[PDB]
Ligand binder design. Structure first.
Ligand code: 2II
Length: 279
């Protein structure tokens, strides 16, 4: 809980179902420096009880660090709450894959799959369920390092095309329904940011899933990769993969990436890679 007077919103970065994200500046009290931060200002007013719930839930998730999960760094208790996290200059992975649609290699796509599975497995080990995993909620720290944002905002504050059937029908959320959203997240990556079930209304999604219909195989995917996605969308939650199995599977694929993804010109920066690490 920090003083609102210390944070200044300077530029809009985007928005989600709960708020507007800004690139902000932190000016510590007594100081003249401006430290860049990311601020999400919630659209709806919230009760002090709901603010305490956000802080408590963030305190438990952030008790231990995980390199692939964003932690809530601070909060400003204004008219509407302002959540503060580390600024990710590269924005979200959904926008990143759309921008680099002609320059993304199989090695990067497969590593991002491992990283998201590692961040999701960390939440599962802590018995925490995200409820809103999507490529828009995976942020890019560097092209080699992605992190999941917005943990717990869904439960505390509806993305039908990312939800497991049991979640659509009964608002049931488990680690296995997060696995279903992981499959959809992978499908967005593998199609370079396509919209799932494009042209199908959200009201028809449950029935479409009930008939056996699923997202199609992205052109770059071998059957081995698509089969893992399909298993994430099994009606029976217990038949879907576990995040630790997904980690193993995608990590195996990442060690020989051209055997699992076929991308045009895949075979074609070392200094930038080194500098990203050093910085
Ligand atoms: C590309 C899609 C897009 O535009 N988005 C807007 C919504 C979502 N997003 C992006 C960012 C962001 C952008 C740049 N740098 C950093 C972050 C955020 C964001 C911004 C500020 C604060 C945020 O807090 C998320 C958070 C993290 C942990 C926890 C909670 C909330 C609540 N809780 C209990 C936690 O443990 C997120 N949002 C993509």
């Amino acid at each position: 809980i920090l003083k609102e007077t210390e944070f200044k919103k300077i530029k809009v970065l985007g928005s989600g179902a709960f708020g507007t994200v800004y690139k902000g500046l932190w000016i510590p009290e007594g100081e003249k420096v401006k430290i860049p931060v990311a601020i999400k200002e919630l659209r709806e007013a919230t009760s002090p009880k709901a603010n305490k719930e956000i802080l408590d839930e963030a305190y438990v998730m952030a008790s231990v660090d995980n390199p692939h999960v964003c932690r809530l760094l601070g909060i400003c208790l204004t008219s509407t709450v302002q959540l503060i996290t580390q600024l990710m200059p590269f924005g979200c992975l959904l926008d990143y894959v759309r921008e680099h649609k002609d320059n993304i290699g199989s090695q990067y796509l497969l590593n991002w799959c491992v990283q998201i599975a590692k961040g999701m497995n960390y939440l599962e080990d802590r018995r925490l369920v995200h409820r809103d995993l999507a490529a828009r909620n995976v942020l890019v720290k560097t092209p080699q390092h992605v992190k999941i944002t917005d943990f717990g905002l869904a439960k505390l504050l509806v993305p039908i095309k990312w939800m497991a059937l049991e979640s659509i029908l009964h608002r049931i959320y488990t680690h296995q329904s997060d696995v279903w959203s992981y499959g959809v997240t992978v499908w967005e990556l593998m199609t370079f940011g396509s919209k799932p079930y494009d042209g199908i209304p959200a009201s028809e999604i449950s029935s479409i899933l009930e008939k056996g219909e699923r997202l199609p195989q992205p052109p770059i995917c071998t059957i081995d990769v698509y089969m893992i996605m399909r298993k994430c969308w099994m009606i029976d939650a217990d038949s879907r993969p576990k995040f630790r199995e997904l980690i193993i599977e995608f990590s195996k694929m990442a060690r020989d990436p051209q055997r699992y993804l076929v991308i045009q010109g895949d075979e074609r920066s070392p200094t930038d890679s080194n500098f990203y690490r050093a910085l």
